[PDB]
Write an enzyme that holds these catalytic residues in place. Structure first.
Site, PDB file in Angstrom:
ATOM      1  N   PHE B 316      72.806 -85.876 104.129  1.00 25.23           N
ATOM      2  CA  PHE B 316      71.937 -85.626 102.948  1.00 25.23           C
ATOM      3  C   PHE B 316      72.060 -84.172 102.473  1.00 25.23           C
ATOM      4  CE2 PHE B 316      70.080 -89.438 104.895  1.00 25.23           C
ATOM      5  CZ  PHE B 316      70.128 -90.284 103.811  1.00 25.23           C
ATOM      6  N   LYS B 322      71.919 -81.952  94.163  1.00 23.11           N
ATOM      7  CA  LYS B 322      70.525 -81.798  94.661  1.00 23.11           C
ATOM      8  C   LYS B 322      70.192 -80.306  94.756  1.00 23.11           C
ATOM      9  CE  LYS B 322      69.632 -82.611  99.022  1.00 23.11           C
ATOM     10  NZ  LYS B 322      69.183 -83.126 100.336  1.00 23.11           N
ATOM     11  N   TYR B 323      71.084 -79.527  95.369  1.00 27.12           N
ATOM     12  CA  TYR B 323      70.877 -78.087  95.660  1.00 27.12           C
ATOM     13  C   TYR B 323      71.030 -77.291  94.358  1.00 27.12           C
ATOM     14  CZ  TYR B 323      70.682 -79.527 100.534  1.00 27.12           C
ATOM     15  OH  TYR B 323      70.305 -80.109 101.713  1.00 27.12           O
ATOM     16  N   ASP B 408      54.324 -77.516 111.701  1.00 30.14           N
ATOM     17  CA  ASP B 408      53.858 -78.489 110.684  1.00 30.14           C
ATOM     18  C   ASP B 408      53.203 -77.670 109.569  1.00 30.14           C
ATOM     19  OD1 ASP B 408      52.370 -80.664 109.287  1.00 30.14           O
ATOM     20  OD2 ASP B 408      52.954 -81.874 111.034  1.00 30.14           O
ATOM     21  N   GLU B 424      61.318 -80.683  99.937  1.00 22.66           N
ATOM     22  CA  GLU B 424      62.442 -81.654  99.886  1.00 22.66           C
ATOM     23  C   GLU B 424      61.994 -82.911 100.655  1.00 22.66           C
ATOM     24  OE1 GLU B 424      66.016 -79.973 101.684  1.00 22.66           O
ATOM     25  OE2 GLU B 424      67.271 -81.636 101.001  1.00 22.66           O
ATOM     26  N   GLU B 433      57.904 -90.919 102.316  1.00 23.61           N
ATOM     27  CA  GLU B 433      58.042 -89.986 103.474  1.00 23.61           C
ATOM     28  C   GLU B 433      56.761 -89.145 103.610  1.00 23.61           C
ATOM     29  OE1 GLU B 433      61.806 -87.871 103.452  1.00 23.61           O
ATOM     30  OE2 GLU B 433      62.957 -89.737 103.394  1.00 23.61           O
TER      31      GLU B 433
END
Ligand SMILES: C[C@@]1(O)[C@@H]([C@H](O)c2ccc(Cl)c(Cl)c2)O[C@@H](n2ccc3c(N)ncnc32)[C@@H]1O
Lengths: 312, 626
Positions: B316, B322-323, B408, B424, B433
């Site tokens: 991925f 994407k970047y 986290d 992301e 997600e």
């Protein structure tokens, strides 16, 4: 034993038995089992010598099986192949060899039925590919190709005395009366949608607007075109009616074949005169002797050539 | 790979020669009878019953190898299990079992049976009984035509004309022949379609019915080929489309009928398909890579509950678009927040929330340089295995520009509030997600005027037909759980053999930051999908779009798909029972996003044109871990 440049051994499954004008016997045979699945044509100038390959007038091997055949006059033999080919073999002058004149791969599945038209210069073939074809035997070509039916064509029968007319019948449960003169050549006949599939056809030799058809359920039926829906019938067989052949008699008799392995012989009221359990497998043809109208020759897949004497 | 092609004959005098001739012509395999097509057999009535001699030719005529790979069997055409004559039914029963049993004895890879009428109820019963007699994997190819033979007969019966009336449903009848047969056989994975193509194609809607169906073979009769002026056999423009569509379904092409082009060799037809195969519209980047994953069901990643493997990150990360889009989104945001006059005095607190192995941290740096603005960067990552990658980058390259935080984002106490949070955390259904819950917990250390990248994301649903994927899902039953659980969970799948019944519509939307007081990420959404075909509903395809910043977007919604992000396959939401849908009808689906302190999940129900059971109630079958 005099096998004159012919196959040493004749295939078990006899499909075709047809007497010529003079009284000599045409046999068609195929192998439907074993290593090799092919066919052979045989002429027996001694009817009573057959099926023995040794006491043979003439014989040859075809590439594939013999679904149907018929005489083209006196010299010629028209053949419905498994190959999808209609092929014409004719005897040489001596009538000792049988030579292929044309082999034309025009049908897309097994050729199941073939009939010579009244003139004898044209013929019609039927196939599992659902098509019916009209052939020029002179030019070795398809003049017309008709997809009239929705399933396998079972049987086609040329009109006795009309070069443009013939019956066909198919597993789509249609009996088509054809006439290549009409711009829509075919015409459906018979009313009942739930009536059992038609398996065999024979034109009446005298009354050129009457015919008989056998169904897959053993029923033989008498149809007048002019009468139309009004019909006479008899439950003759216990299994499918394979073939119907009228005698050369003045007021003729009707031979009926079946997968019940029996032969029947009927009058024009379809009442039962003769019977024969002689065969131990399927009965595939009947042919009446031109010389003695009392005699009737049947062949089966049991490889018997039974000569019946009809009480008449 | 070049096209796989077989020859169809109903006549083989010698197997050895026939196979050799056929092999020499260039065919991969041969469809042929295993008993002689005209050899009707009796099983009950004497004397025909006791017919002596071999019932067919010996298995010793070919190697086991040849039987297993080169030979497709064909049911004898006299076998009619649905005849109106009892004696014919009973014989055709015995004969079908006989021929099917011989196919298995030979170890044939496939065996052809026709659907040539509407009632095949007894045919199906006998085939079903055969399938449930041993544990064989042998395939059954149902020979069924696009156009019923009755509907393509020449109009030459004067007193029985061909109907010129358009029949939308009538013209689809052969699909229903297939649907009824495979329904009766309870969707056996061993029963597939051999679709016979006619001279005249039907309407597109009729060809469209076979979308999503398990077509393993397409049968081209010689007859339907037109002739090139040079003499080569060719196909109409319309026929060439169907062939191109069928090549994408990697079906095997069967050629049936005699050679109608006499002067030409039989390999001529075959060479046209290979020619047609060479020349096809070029496949895009997500049509070329996605090769291998077609209709392959996978569990959606849960990178919150689970720590992604090094090689999952890798897959991925291989997505420059994407970047480049994230770089551009940060670029545009920095300039809007730091005027040219303040560029050297004003340092922006940029925080990558879920920084993985760094490439988004890199992208954030590439953005600050090309913008000519100064940034203090925090790289927060919960996956301690990826944190190893970050801290090695941080020491070897980034220096003290980057503070790596092993935490986290919901638990982390920040030294200072942020100007931009960059995340992301999206899946194929956007919020699957748990981006919402993650960023919500991180929200308290974004400045009152702070920007979230991404700013919003939206999920999209579309109803699909795929008897194939339905059967894939069906086959995911596991021991030691609810036997229908596989239907109550989403799959990531490169949807390949399927039909989209309606344009995608938005489902769930989330905004970041969520200034909204008393935040609630639960959702209920009713969608109405106008369907303009007859079809069968097997589930719902999920997609998404996200606004990173302003006009900078990423999308896997097909009609706005970003150029790349090929790795991101659609979501499939299956339903337990397929639902028949008629043209003009509306498919109403209801999706819920549900949660407690521990887990988030989806429930869904179809409410039109009929009701389904509510799927995944209480997240019994599927949950996403907080
Ligand atoms: C996979 C992650 O690295 C990362 C993200 O999902 C990601 C980044 C790059 C790629 Cl290429 C891919 Cl495929 C996926 O976000 C992290 N994550 C998730 C939730 C969370 C939290 N609440 N606090 C901190 N980090 C968090 C995960 O571990």
């Amino acid at each position: 034993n005099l096998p004159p440049n012919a196959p040493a051994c004749m295939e078990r499954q006899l499909e075709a038995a047809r007497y010529r004008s003079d009284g000599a016997l045409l046999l068609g045979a195929s192998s439907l089992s074993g290593r090799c699945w092919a066919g052979s044509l045989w002429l027996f100038k001694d009817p009573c010598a057959a099926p023995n390959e040794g006491f043979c007038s003439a014989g040859v091997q075809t590439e594939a099986g013999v679904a149907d055949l018929t005489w083209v006059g006196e010299r010629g033999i028209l053949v419905a192949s498994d190959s999808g080919a209609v092929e014409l073999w004719e005897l040489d002058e001596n009538e000792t060899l049988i030579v292929s004149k044309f082999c034309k791969y025009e049908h897309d599945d097994i050729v199941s039925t073939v009939s010579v038209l009244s003139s004898g210069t044209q013929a019609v073939s039927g196939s599992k590919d659902i098509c019916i074809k009209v052939w020029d035997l002179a030019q070795q070509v398809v003049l017309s190709s008709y997809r009239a039916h929705a399933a396998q064509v079972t049987c086609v029968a040329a009109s006795p005395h009309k070069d443009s007319v013939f019956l066909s019948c198919s597993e789509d449960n249609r009996i088509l009366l054809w006439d290549t003169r009409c711009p829509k050549p075919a015409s459906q006949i018979g009313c009942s949608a739930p009536g059992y599939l038609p398996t065999s056809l024979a034109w009446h030799p005298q009354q050129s607007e009457v015919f008989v058809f056998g169904d897959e359920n053993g029923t033989v039926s008498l149809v007048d075109t002019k009468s139309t829906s009004c019909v006479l019938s008899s439950a003759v067989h216990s299994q499918c009616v394979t073939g119907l052949v009228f005698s050369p008699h003045s007021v003729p008799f009707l031979a009926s074949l079946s997968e019940d392995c029996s032969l029947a012989v009927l009058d024009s009221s379809l009442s039962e005169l003769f019977r024969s359990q002689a065969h131990r497998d399927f009965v595939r043809d009947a042919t009446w002797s031109p010389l003695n109208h009392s005699l009737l020759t049947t062949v089966g897949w049991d490889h018997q050539v039974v000569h019946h004497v009809v009480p008449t | 790979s070049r096209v796989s092609s077989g020859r169809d004959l109903n006549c083989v005098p010698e197997i050895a020669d026939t196979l050799g001739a056929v092999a020499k012509q260039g065919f991969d395999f041969l469809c042929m009878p295993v008993f002689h097509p005209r050899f009707k057999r009796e099983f009950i009535q004497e004397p025909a019953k006791n017919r002596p001699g071999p019932q067919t030719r010996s298995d010793l005529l070919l190697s086991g190898r040849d039987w297993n790979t080169l030979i497709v069997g064909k049911l004898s055409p006299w076998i009619r299990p649905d005849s109106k004559v009892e004696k014919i039914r009973r014989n055709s029963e015995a004969a079908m079992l006989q021929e099917l049993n011989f196919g298995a004895y030979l170890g044939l890879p496939a065996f052809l049976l026709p659907l040539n009428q509407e009632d095949n109820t007894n045919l199906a019963r006998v085939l079903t009984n055969h399938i449930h007699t041993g544990h064989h994997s042998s395939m059954f190819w149902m020979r069924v035509p696009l156009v019923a033979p009755e509907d393509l007969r020449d109009d030459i019966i004067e007193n029985a004309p061909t109907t010129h009336t358009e029949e939308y449903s009538g013209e689809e009848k052969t699909w229903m022949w297939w649907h009824n047969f495979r329904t009766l056989c309870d969707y056996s994975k061993r029963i597939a379609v051999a679709l016979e193509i006619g001279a005249d194609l039907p309407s597109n809607h009729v060809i469209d019915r076979w979308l999503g169906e398990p077509i393993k073979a397409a049968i081209l009769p010689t007859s339907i080929f037109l002739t090139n002026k040079k003499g080569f056999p060719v196909l109409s423009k319309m026929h060439q489309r169907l062939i191109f569509r069928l090549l994408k379904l990697e079906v095997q092409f069967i050629i049936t009928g005699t050679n109608h082009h006499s002067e030409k060799e039989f390999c001529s037809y075959l060479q046209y398909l290979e020619y047609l195969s060479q020349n096809r519209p070029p496949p895009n980047a997500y049509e070329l890579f996605a090769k291998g994953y077609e209709d392959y069901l996978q569990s959606p990643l849960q990178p919150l509950m689970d720590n992604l493997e090094s090689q999952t990150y890798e897959v991925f990360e291989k997505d420059p678009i994407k970047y480049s889009q994230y770089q551009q989104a940060i670029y545009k945001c920095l300039l809007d927040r730091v005027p040219e006059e303040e560029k050297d005095t004003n340092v922006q607190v940029l925080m990558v929330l879920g920084a993985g192995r760094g490439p988004l941290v890199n992208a954030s740096l590439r953005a600050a340089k090309q913008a000519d603005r100064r940034i203090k960067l925090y790289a927060v990552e919960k996956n301690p295995n990826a944190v190893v990658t970050l801290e090695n980058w941080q020491f070897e390259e980034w220096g003290s520009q980057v503070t790596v935080v092993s935490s986290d984002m919901r638990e982390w106490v920040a030294p200072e509030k942020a100007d931009i949070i960059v995340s992301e955390l999206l899946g194929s259904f956007a919020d699957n997600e748990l981006s919402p819950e993650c960023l919500d917990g991180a929200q308290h250390f974004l400045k009152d005027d702070g920007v979230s990248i991404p700013g919003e994301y939206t999920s999209f649903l579309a109803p699909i037909s795929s008897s194939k994927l339905y059967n894939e899902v069906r086959a995911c039953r596991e021991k030691d759980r609810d036997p229908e659980a596989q239907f109550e969970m989403p799959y990531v799948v490169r949807l390949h053999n399927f039909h989209q019944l309606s344009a995608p519509q938005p489902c769930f939307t989330f905004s970041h930051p969520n200034r909204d007081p008393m935040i609630d990420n639960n959702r209920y959404c009713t969608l109405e999908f106008p369907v303009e075909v007859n079809t069968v509903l097997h589930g719902f395809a999920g997609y998404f779009e996200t606004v990173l910043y302003q006009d900078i977007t990423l999308s896997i919604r097909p009609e706005t798909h970003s150029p790349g992000m090929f790795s991101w396959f659609p979501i499939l939401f299956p339903i337990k029972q397929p639902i028949t849908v008629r043209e003009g009808q509306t498919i109403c689906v209801r999706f819920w996003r549900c949660s407690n302190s521990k887990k988030v999940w989806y429930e869904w129900a179809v409410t039109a044109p009929v009701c389904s059971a509510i799927h995944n109630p209480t997240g019994r079958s599927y949950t996403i871990g907080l």
